[PDB]
Amino acid sequence: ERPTFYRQELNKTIWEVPERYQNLSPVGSGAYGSVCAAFDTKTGHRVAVKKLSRPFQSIIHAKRTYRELRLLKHMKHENVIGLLDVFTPARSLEEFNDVYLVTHLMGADLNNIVKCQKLTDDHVQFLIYQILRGLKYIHSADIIHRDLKPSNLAVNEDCELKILDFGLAHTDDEMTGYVATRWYRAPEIMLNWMHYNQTVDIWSVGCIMAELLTGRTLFPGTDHIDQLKLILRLVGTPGAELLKKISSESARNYIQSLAQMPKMNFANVFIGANPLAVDLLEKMLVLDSDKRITAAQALAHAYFAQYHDPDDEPVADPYDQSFESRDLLIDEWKSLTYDEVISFVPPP
Ligand SMILES: Nc1ccc(Nc2ccccc2)cc1
Ligand SMILES: [Cl-]
Ligand SMILES: [Cl-]
Numbered sequence: 001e002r003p004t005f006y007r008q009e010l011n012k013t014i015w016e017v018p019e020r021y022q023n024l025s026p027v028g029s030g031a032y033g034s035v036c037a038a039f040d041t042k043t044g045h046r047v048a049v050k051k052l053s054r055p056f057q058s059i060i061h062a063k064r065t066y067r068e069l070r071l072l073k074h075m076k077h078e079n080v081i082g083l084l085d086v087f088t089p090a091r092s093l094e095e096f097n098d099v100y101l102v103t104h105l106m107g108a109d110l111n112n113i114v115k116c117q118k119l120t121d122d123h124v125q126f127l128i129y130q131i132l133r134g135l136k137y138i139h140s141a142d143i144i145h146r147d148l149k150p151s152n153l154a155v156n157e158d159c160e161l162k163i164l165d166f167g168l169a170h171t172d173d174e175m176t177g178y179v180a181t182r183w184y185r186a187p188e189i190m191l192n193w194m195h196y197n198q199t200v201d202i203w204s205v206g207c208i209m210a211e212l213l214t215g216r217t218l219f220p221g222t223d224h225i226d227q228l229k230l231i232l233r234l235v236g237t238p239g240a241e242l243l244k245k246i247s248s249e250s251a252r253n254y255i256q257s258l259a260q261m262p263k264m265n266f267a268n269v270f271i272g273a274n275p276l277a278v279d280l281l282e283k284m285l286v287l288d289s290d291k292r293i294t295a296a297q298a299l300a301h302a303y304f305a306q307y308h309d310p311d312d313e314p315v316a317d318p319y320d321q322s323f324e325s326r327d328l329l330i331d332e333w334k335s336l337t338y339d340e341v342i343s344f345v346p347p348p
């Protein structure tokens with residue numbers, strides 16, 4: 001049975017939502033939609049309600065809408081954002097135009113915490129442990145997050161953490177200059193010299209952990225090339241083993257122009273840090289992505305001895321991504337999205 005919907009205009013936008021959602025108040029609007037905070041009378045939760053902007057305006061946009069809904073419906077883990085509800089006011093596929101997504105309302109992010117709070121080593125242990133616990137789950141479904149950074153990590157008053165804002169495939173201008181959008185990205189993808197794989201997310205975790213330990217951005221480059229130079233000064237220029245593996249002619253020709261540099265001593269960079277934290281950073285921030293520690297391996301590192309429990313670090317159900325190689329028309333992506341809206345089953 002379909003709920004009753006009511007309409008209201010908020011900051012020049014029409015919102016048509018089920019009666020269960022009350023006290024709507026605008027909180028932001030990006031290029032993908034607008035967001036209101038609300039009170040959900042069915043669950044008692046404060047929620048974020050996002051109305052997608054132009055979800056089916058082109059093939060690229062229609063596929064992106066389907067991609068986002070499929071991802072959010074799959075994620076069921078304590079350290080990853082999940083979907084509380086999805087709805088449309090349409091009564092049939094023929095009148096289907098608008099999609100609304102509902103999640104738990106998040107307060108502070110990790111940006112707020114590192115700028116404002118004095119963190120003990122125990123705080124860093126617990127925060128990084130939770131990132132890695134969620135990432136083990138994500139990676140076990142063969143998903144790559146692609147955009148891990150402090151503003152995409154929600155944290156509450158009890159220091160409990162959730163991963164947000166999966167990369168749905170950011171423009172070139174958004175990555176240009178002195179911008180946090182690029183400071184956490186792995187070197188092999190910053191100029192697209194290699195195809196994305198899950199090891200890029202571990203590089204991001206290393207950059208985040210360093211910033212929690214020092215209070216400062218690790219690689220705050222003023223552009224792509226300045227940032228690469230900061231990276232290679234810390235971790236060294238590519239050695240013979242890694243050079244043999246480089247398959248990008250653009251990478252090779254530029255890298256060969258730089259004077260060679262050795263890896264620095266991390267104990268002299270991260271002065272005063274727990275030696276076990278330094279050891280883990282050395283295993284994450286490895287230039288050769290084949291040699292980086294994985295999320296599952298990192299959970300067993302001695303730095304996390306007080307939190308690690310191998311019986312409480314779950315993996316995901318399998319996730320079918322075959323749609324990503326499929327070529328369909330706008331109305332076919334739209335019909336697939338409609339089916340996923342109507343089949344949604346809420347959590348307990
Ligand atoms: N194919 C391939 C392999 C490794 C890399 N990584 C890299 C290259 C130059 C500088 C820093 C990192 C790129 C392409
Ligand atoms: Cl309702
Ligand atoms: Cl609609």
Ligand SMILES: [Cl-]
Pocket residue numbers: 111149150151152180
């Ligand atoms: Cl950020």
Ligand SMILES: [Cl-]
Pocket residue numbers: 318319320321
């Ligand atoms: Cl699936």
Ligand SMILES: [Mg+2]
Pocket residue numbers: 151152165
């Ligand atoms: Mg974000």
